[PDB]
């Protein structure tokens, strides 16, 4: 309370450096959890096709995988270009 505000302000009187670094490092760790874009970050990171998506043997009854790289079936990233 009174001590905390005084100590913080008083510390900022002698040293402005470490309080600045502590504040930055303090921010650097919390909001990564609080950010809503981290899930977006891993989604686009997974979206990059470094390797070839080797085709799967079509034996019927997997409708999710498309039969052509134009069909609506399969994963789509219409969010990505908007993102």
């Amino acid at each position: 309370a009174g001590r905390i505000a005084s100590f913080l302000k008083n510390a900022w009187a002698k040293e402005p450096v470490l309080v600045a670094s502590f504040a930055i490092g303090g921010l650097a760790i919390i909001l990564p959890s609080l950010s809503p874009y981290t899930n977006y970050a891993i989604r686009i990171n997974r979206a990059t096709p470094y390797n070839y998506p080797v085709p799967l043997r079509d034996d019927g009854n997997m409708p999710d995988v498309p039969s052509h790289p134009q069909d609506p079936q399969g994963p789509s990233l219409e969010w990505l270009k908007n993102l």
């Binding site: 979206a47 096709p49 993102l83």
Partner: peptide
């Protein structure tokens, strides 16, 4: 940076078709 990632996956997709 977001635009570049779209450019990269577009560039990568060309390589996929070229395999």
């Amino acid at each position: 940076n977001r635009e570049r990632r779209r450019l990269q996956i577009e560039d990568f997709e060309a390589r996929i078709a070229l395999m």
